[PDB]
Amino acid sequence: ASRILLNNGAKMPILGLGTWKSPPGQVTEAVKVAIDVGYRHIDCAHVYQNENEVGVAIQEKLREQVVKREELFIVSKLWCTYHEKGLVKGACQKTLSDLKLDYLDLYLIHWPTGFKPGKEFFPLDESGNVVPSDTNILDTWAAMEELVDEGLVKAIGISNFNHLQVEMILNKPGLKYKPAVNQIECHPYLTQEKLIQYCQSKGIVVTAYSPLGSPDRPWAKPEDPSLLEDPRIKAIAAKHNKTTAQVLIRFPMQRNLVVIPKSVTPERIAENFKVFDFELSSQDMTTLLSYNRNWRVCALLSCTSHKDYPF
Ligand SMILES: NC(=O)c1ccc[n+]([C@@H]2O[C@H](COP(=O)([O-])OP(=O)(O)OC[C@H]3O[C@@H](n4cnc5c(N)ncnc54)[C@H](OP(=O)(O)O)[C@@H]3O)[C@@H](O)[C@H]2O)c1
Ligand SMILES: O=C(O)COc1cc(Cl)ccc1C(=O)NCc1ccc(Br)cc1F
């Protein structure tokens, strides 16, 4: 089954194309190729600085009538410097204009932390600590709810929310819409059993990011573990006559997760989509889960300061 039902009643494709680090000079063709070979979900964000180019691709494949708007599932995220009530609508509208869309299928609070508004995405103090905003997640959530009620977004959700923060939203006084999705880091080195079971038990669909361990993350270090090069994962792939990436993408799909591998390489974009015709065994799944080491791609010292830093 290629889509999962969300608690807003809409279906979300379980495979999407990620776009963080996709160069603006390459991402338009990457998205065009992706849609040509089957992808119907694109994961975006304003902070990635490439939504205009992603939007050129979506608009061209709409204009060519390759796909209909209803068949696409486009996701973006509210950056930290826009948590303020009077900045959320405009942030969403900027993303809409850049993506050439009149609505988003899903809009996420990108991180639970609000930062000081301004030109800078990471406003720092002179000692390098992020400068917080006094906004809290519950008031930010109410602002997200407004976007649903104005027709700018079909679904709202959260990203990098820990258990307690998910719970805070669900327990919000006067909660109007539950989050549809929690998008978090998840792969065999960070298997997330606790947060996923919690989210799923509440009917929140979990999207796994960095499913390949983000080998192109700008802060990678030599000593870091490498999923794609792990011989134990390579051996499961070889057994199935698939690539290691293919196994890493199928893994979350069998846990009822949505997964969003990024590539700008046409051959890999296509390879990564060829994951609906094979199954990992229960033993394969448990074996992959055994590799957990609580290793995170996405953590940031400058922000650990903040009252709502999630890890
Ligand atoms: N919500 C958040 O806070 C958050 C955080 C991180 C990521 N995300 C989203 O999740 C997406 C995916 O995560 P990510 O970009 O961190 O990393 P990823 O998808 O785990 O890994 C991307 C890297 O893997 C390479 N790659 C892709 N397919 C491959 C294949 N078949 N074989 C070998 N290498 C392959 C890509 O190379 P090429 O591109 O050169 O082919 C790129 O270097 C992001 O792009 C973003 O949309 C969200
Ligand atoms: O956050 C993403 O989606 C991917 O990571 C980044 C993307 C870009 Cl364009 C810039 C920087 C990051 C980035 O540094 N992400 C890590 C991060 C960020 C904020 C917080 Br509150 C915590 C944290 F771990």
Coordinates of C-alpha atoms and ligand atoms in Angstrom, one line a residue:
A1 CA 0.0 0.0 0.0
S2 CA 1.5 3.3 -1.1
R3 CA -0.3 5.7 1.3
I4 CA -1.1 5.9 5.0
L5 CA -4.4 7.4 6.4
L6 CA -3.9 10.5 8.6
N7 CA -6.2 11.6 11.4
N8 CA -7.4 14.5 9.2
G9 CA -8.9 11.9 6.8
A10 CA -6.4 12.5 4.0
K11 CA -3.9 9.8 2.6
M12 CA -0.2 10.5 2.7
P13 CA 2.4 8.7 0.5
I14 CA 4.7 6.6 2.6
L15 CA 7.7 7.5 0.4
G16 CA 8.7 11.1 -0.2
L17 CA 11.7 13.0 -1.6
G18 CA 13.8 14.9 0.8
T19 CA 15.3 18.3 -0.2
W20 CA 17.6 19.4 2.6
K21 CA 21.1 20.1 1.0
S22 CA 19.7 19.7 -2.5
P23 CA 21.6 22.4 -4.4
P24 CA 19.3 25.0 -5.9
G25 CA 20.9 24.4 -9.3
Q26 CA 20.1 20.7 -9.1
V27 CA 16.8 20.3 -7.1
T28 CA 14.5 21.4 -9.9
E29 CA 15.6 18.5 -12.1
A30 CA 15.7 16.2 -9.0
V31 CA 12.1 16.9 -8.3
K32 CA 11.1 16.5 -12.0
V33 CA 12.8 13.2 -12.2
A34 CA 11.3 12.1 -8.9
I35 CA 7.7 12.8 -10.1
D36 CA 8.4 11.2 -13.5
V37 CA 9.4 7.9 -11.8
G38 CA 6.6 7.8 -9.3
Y39 CA 7.1 10.1 -6.3
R40 CA 4.1 12.0 -5.2
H41 CA 5.4 13.5 -1.8
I42 CA 8.1 16.1 -1.5
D43 CA 9.4 17.2 1.9
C44 CA 10.4 20.8 1.9
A45 CA 11.3 23.6 4.4
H46 CA 11.9 27.4 4.1
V47 CA 15.1 27.0 6.0
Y48 CA 16.5 24.8 3.2
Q49 CA 16.6 28.0 1.0
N50 CA 15.5 26.0 -2.1
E51 CA 11.7 26.1 -2.1
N52 CA 11.6 28.4 -5.1
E53 CA 13.5 25.8 -7.2
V54 CA 11.5 22.9 -5.8
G55 CA 8.4 24.9 -6.7
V56 CA 9.5 25.4 -10.3
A57 CA 9.6 21.6 -10.7
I58 CA 6.2 21.0 -9.2
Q59 CA 4.6 23.7 -11.3
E60 CA 6.2 22.4 -14.5
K61 CA 4.9 18.8 -13.9
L62 CA 1.4 20.3 -13.0
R63 CA 1.5 22.3 -16.2
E64 CA 2.6 19.3 -18.3
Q65 CA -0.2 17.4 -16.7
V66 CA 2.2 14.7 -15.5
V67 CA 0.3 14.7 -12.3
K68 CA -2.8 16.5 -10.8
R69 CA -2.5 18.7 -7.8
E70 CA -4.7 16.4 -5.8
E71 CA -2.3 13.5 -6.4
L72 CA 0.7 15.4 -4.9
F73 CA 1.4 15.6 -1.2
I74 CA 3.6 18.6 -0.5
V75 CA 5.0 19.2 3.0
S76 CA 6.8 22.2 4.4
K77 CA 7.9 23.5 7.8
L78 CA 7.6 26.6 9.9
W79 CA 11.1 27.7 10.9
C80 CA 12.0 28.7 14.5
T81 CA 12.3 32.4 13.9
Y82 CA 8.5 32.5 12.9
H83 CA 6.8 31.0 16.0
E84 CA 5.2 34.3 16.9
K85 CA 1.4 34.6 16.3
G86 CA 1.7 37.5 13.9
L87 CA 4.4 35.9 11.8
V88 CA 3.0 32.3 11.2
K89 CA 0.6 33.2 8.4
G90 CA 3.2 35.2 6.4
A91 CA 5.8 32.4 6.8
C92 CA 3.3 29.9 5.5
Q93 CA 2.4 32.2 2.6
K94 CA 6.0 32.8 1.6
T95 CA 6.5 29.0 1.4
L96 CA 3.3 28.7 -0.6
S97 CA 4.4 31.5 -3.0
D98 CA 7.8 29.9 -3.4
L99 CA 6.4 26.4 -4.0
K100 CA 3.9 27.8 -6.5
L101 CA 1.0 26.3 -4.5
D102 CA -2.3 27.5 -3.1
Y103 CA -2.2 25.0 -0.2
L104 CA 0.2 22.6 1.6
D105 CA -0.9 19.1 2.3
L106 CA 1.0 19.2 5.5
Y107 CA 2.7 22.0 7.4
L108 CA 5.0 21.2 10.4
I109 CA 6.4 23.1 13.3
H110 CA 10.0 22.4 12.3
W111 CA 11.5 22.3 15.8
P112 CA 9.8 22.9 19.2
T113 CA 12.0 25.9 19.9
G114 CA 11.1 29.4 18.9
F115 CA 14.0 31.8 18.2
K116 CA 14.2 35.6 18.1
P117 CA 12.6 36.9 14.8
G118 CA 14.7 38.6 12.3
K119 CA 16.7 38.0 9.1
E120 CA 19.0 35.4 10.8
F121 CA 17.7 31.7 11.0
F122 CA 20.0 31.1 14.0
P123 CA 20.2 34.4 15.9
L124 CA 23.0 34.0 18.4
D125 CA 24.3 35.9 21.5
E126 CA 27.9 36.9 21.6
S127 CA 28.8 33.6 23.2
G128 CA 27.1 31.6 20.5
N129 CA 23.9 30.5 22.3
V130 CA 20.7 30.7 20.3
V131 CA 18.5 33.7 21.3
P132 CA 15.1 32.3 22.3
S133 CA 11.7 33.7 21.7
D134 CA 9.3 33.7 24.7
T135 CA 6.6 31.9 22.5
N136 CA 5.6 28.5 23.7
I137 CA 4.6 25.4 21.7
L138 CA 0.9 25.7 22.6
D139 CA 0.4 29.2 21.3
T140 CA 2.4 28.2 18.2
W141 CA 0.1 25.3 17.7
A142 CA -3.0 27.5 17.9
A143 CA -1.5 29.6 15.1
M144 CA -1.0 26.4 13.1
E145 CA -4.6 25.6 13.7
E146 CA -5.6 28.9 12.2
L147 CA -3.9 28.0 8.9
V148 CA -6.2 24.9 8.6
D149 CA -9.2 27.2 9.2
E150 CA -8.1 29.6 6.5
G151 CA -7.5 26.9 3.9
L152 CA -3.8 27.4 3.5
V153 CA -2.9 23.9 4.7
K154 CA -4.9 20.6 4.7
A155 CA -3.0 19.1 7.8
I156 CA -0.7 20.4 10.5
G157 CA 2.0 18.5 12.5
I158 CA 5.1 18.7 14.4
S159 CA 8.8 17.7 14.0
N160 CA 11.5 16.9 16.5
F161 CA 8.9 16.9 19.4
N162 CA 9.8 14.6 22.2
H163 CA 7.3 12.5 24.1
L164 CA 6.6 15.2 26.7
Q165 CA 6.1 17.8 24.0
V166 CA 3.8 15.6 21.9
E167 CA 1.8 15.0 25.2
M168 CA 1.7 18.8 25.8
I169 CA 0.1 19.4 22.5
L170 CA -2.4 16.6 23.0
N171 CA -3.2 17.9 26.4
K172 CA -3.5 21.5 25.2
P173 CA -6.5 23.3 26.6
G174 CA -9.0 23.9 23.8
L175 CA -7.1 21.7 21.3
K176 CA -8.8 22.0 18.0
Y177 CA -6.8 19.8 15.6
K178 CA -4.4 17.0 16.8
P179 CA -1.1 16.9 15.0
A180 CA -1.3 14.5 12.0
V181 CA 2.4 13.8 11.9
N182 CA 5.5 13.9 14.0
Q183 CA 8.6 13.9 11.7
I184 CA 11.7 12.7 13.6
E185 CA 15.1 11.3 12.9
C186 CA 14.9 7.5 12.6
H187 CA 17.2 4.8 11.2
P188 CA 18.9 1.6 12.5
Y189 CA 21.3 3.7 14.7
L190 CA 18.4 5.7 16.2
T191 CA 15.5 3.3 16.2
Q192 CA 13.0 5.4 18.3
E193 CA 10.8 2.5 19.6
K194 CA 9.4 4.5 22.6
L195 CA 8.5 7.7 20.7
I196 CA 7.1 5.9 17.8
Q197 CA 4.9 3.6 19.9
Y198 CA 3.7 6.6 21.8
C199 CA 2.9 8.6 18.7
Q200 CA 1.3 5.7 16.9
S201 CA -0.8 4.9 20.0
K202 CA -2.3 8.3 19.7
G203 CA -3.0 8.1 15.9
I204 CA -0.1 10.3 15.0
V205 CA 1.8 9.1 11.9
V206 CA 5.6 9.2 12.2
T207 CA 7.8 10.3 9.4
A208 CA 11.4 9.1 9.5
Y209 CA 14.0 11.6 8.4
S210 CA 17.7 11.0 7.6
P211 CA 16.8 7.3 6.9
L212 CA 20.2 6.8 5.2
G213 CA 22.1 8.6 8.1
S214 CA 22.6 11.8 6.1
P215 CA 26.0 11.1 4.7
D216 CA 26.1 14.7 3.3
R217 CA 25.3 16.4 6.7
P218 CA 27.7 19.4 6.8
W219 CA 29.0 18.4 10.3
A220 CA 29.9 14.8 9.5
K221 CA 33.1 13.5 11.3
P222 CA 35.4 10.6 10.3
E223 CA 34.6 8.6 13.5
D224 CA 30.9 8.7 12.9
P225 CA 29.1 5.4 12.2
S226 CA 28.1 5.0 8.5
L227 CA 24.8 3.2 7.8
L228 CA 25.4 2.8 4.1
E229 CA 28.8 1.1 4.8
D230 CA 27.8 -1.1 7.7
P231 CA 28.6 -4.6 6.6
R232 CA 25.7 -6.1 8.6
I233 CA 23.2 -4.0 6.7
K234 CA 25.0 -4.7 3.4
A235 CA 24.6 -8.4 4.1
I236 CA 20.8 -8.1 4.5
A237 CA 20.7 -6.2 1.3
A238 CA 22.8 -8.8 -0.6
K239 CA 20.4 -11.5 0.7
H240 CA 17.5 -9.7 -0.8
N241 CA 19.3 -8.7 -4.0
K242 CA 18.7 -5.0 -3.2
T243 CA 21.0 -2.1 -2.4
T244 CA 21.8 -1.0 1.2
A245 CA 19.8 2.2 0.7
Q246 CA 16.8 0.1 -0.5
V247 CA 16.9 -1.8 2.8
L248 CA 17.2 1.4 4.8
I249 CA 14.1 2.8 3.1
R250 CA 12.0 -0.4 3.3
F251 CA 12.9 -0.7 7.1
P252 CA 10.8 2.2 8.2
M253 CA 8.0 1.4 5.7
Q254 CA 7.5 -1.9 7.5
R255 CA 7.2 -0.1 10.9
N256 CA 4.2 1.9 9.4
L257 CA 6.4 5.0 9.1
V258 CA 6.6 7.4 6.2
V259 CA 10.2 7.9 4.9
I260 CA 11.8 10.7 3.0
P261 CA 15.3 9.8 1.6
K262 CA 17.0 12.8 -0.1
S263 CA 18.9 12.6 -3.4
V264 CA 19.8 14.8 -6.3
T265 CA 21.2 11.9 -8.3
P266 CA 18.7 10.7 -10.9
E267 CA 19.8 7.1 -10.7
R268 CA 19.5 7.1 -6.9
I269 CA 16.1 8.9 -7.0
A270 CA 14.8 6.0 -9.1
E271 CA 16.6 3.3 -7.1
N272 CA 15.2 4.6 -3.8
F273 CA 11.6 4.4 -5.2
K274 CA 12.0 0.7 -6.1
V275 CA 11.1 -0.5 -2.6
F276 CA 7.5 -1.7 -2.9
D277 CA 8.3 -5.1 -4.5
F278 CA 10.3 -6.9 -1.7
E279 CA 9.8 -7.6 2.0
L280 CA 12.1 -7.7 5.0
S281 CA 11.4 -10.6 7.3
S282 CA 10.5 -10.2 10.9
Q283 CA 14.0 -11.4 11.7
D284 CA 15.5 -8.9 9.4
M285 CA 13.5 -6.1 11.1
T286 CA 14.4 -7.2 14.6
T287 CA 18.1 -7.5 13.5
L288 CA 18.1 -3.9 12.1
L289 CA 16.5 -2.7 15.3
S290 CA 19.3 -4.3 17.2
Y291 CA 21.7 -1.8 15.7
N292 CA 20.4 1.1 17.8
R293 CA 23.1 3.2 19.4
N294 CA 21.1 6.4 20.1
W295 CA 23.2 8.1 17.4
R296 CA 21.8 11.4 16.1
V297 CA 22.5 13.2 12.8
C298 CA 20.5 16.1 14.0
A299 CA 21.5 17.8 17.2
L300 CA 23.0 21.2 17.6
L301 CA 25.1 22.5 20.5
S302 CA 24.1 26.2 20.0
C303 CA 20.5 25.3 20.7
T304 CA 20.8 22.9 23.7
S305 CA 20.4 26.0 25.9
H306 CA 16.8 26.6 24.9
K307 CA 14.1 25.7 27.3
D308 CA 12.2 23.5 24.7
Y309 CA 15.4 21.9 23.2
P310 CA 14.0 18.3 22.6
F311 CA 17.0 15.9 23.3
Ligands
LIG1 N1 12.5 17.7 10.2 C1 13.8 17.9 10.4 O1 14.3 18.5 11.3 C2 14.7 17.2 9.3 C3 16.0 17.0 9.6 C4 16.9 16.3 8.6 C5 16.3 15.9 7.5 N2 14.9 16.2 7.2 C6 14.3 15.9 5.9 O2 14.6 14.5 5.7 C7 15.4 14.3 4.4 C8 16.3 13.1 4.3 O3 17.4 13.3 5.3 P1 18.8 13.8 5.0 O4 18.9 14.7 3.8 O5 19.3 14.3 6.3 O6 19.6 12.4 4.6 P2 19.4 11.0 4.0 O7 18.2 11.0 3.1 O8 19.5 10.0 5.1 O9 20.7 10.9 3.1 C9 20.9 11.8 2.0 C10 22.3 11.4 1.4 O10 22.3 10.0 1.0 C11 22.7 10.0 -0.4 N3 22.0 9.0 -1.1 C12 20.7 9.0 -1.5 N4 20.3 7.9 -2.1 C13 21.4 7.1 -2.0 C14 21.5 5.8 -2.6 N5 20.6 5.1 -3.2 N6 22.8 5.2 -2.4 C15 23.8 5.9 -1.8 N7 23.7 7.2 -1.3 C16 22.4 7.8 -1.4 C17 22.5 11.4 -1.0 O11 23.4 11.6 -2.0 P3 23.0 12.5 -3.4 O12 21.9 13.5 -3.0 O13 24.3 13.0 -3.8 O14 22.5 11.3 -4.3 C18 22.8 12.3 0.2 O15 24.2 12.4 0.4 C19 16.0 15.7 4.2 O16 16.4 16.0 2.9 C20 14.8 16.6 4.7 O17 13.8 16.7 3.7 C21 14.1 16.8 8.1
LIG2 O1 16.7 21.0 10.7 C1 16.6 20.3 9.5 O2 15.6 20.1 8.9 C2 18.0 19.8 9.0 O3 19.1 20.5 9.7 C3 19.3 21.8 9.4 C4 19.0 22.4 8.2 C5 19.5 23.6 7.9 CL1 19.0 24.4 6.4 C6 20.2 24.4 8.8 C7 20.5 23.8 10.1 C8 20.0 22.5 10.4 C9 20.4 22.0 11.7 O4 21.4 22.4 12.3 N1 19.6 21.0 12.3 C10 19.8 20.6 13.7 C11 19.0 21.5 14.6 C12 18.3 22.7 14.3 C13 17.5 23.4 15.2 C14 17.4 22.9 16.5 BR1 16.3 23.7 17.7 C15 18.0 21.7 16.9 C16 18.9 21.0 16.0 F1 19.4 19.9 16.3

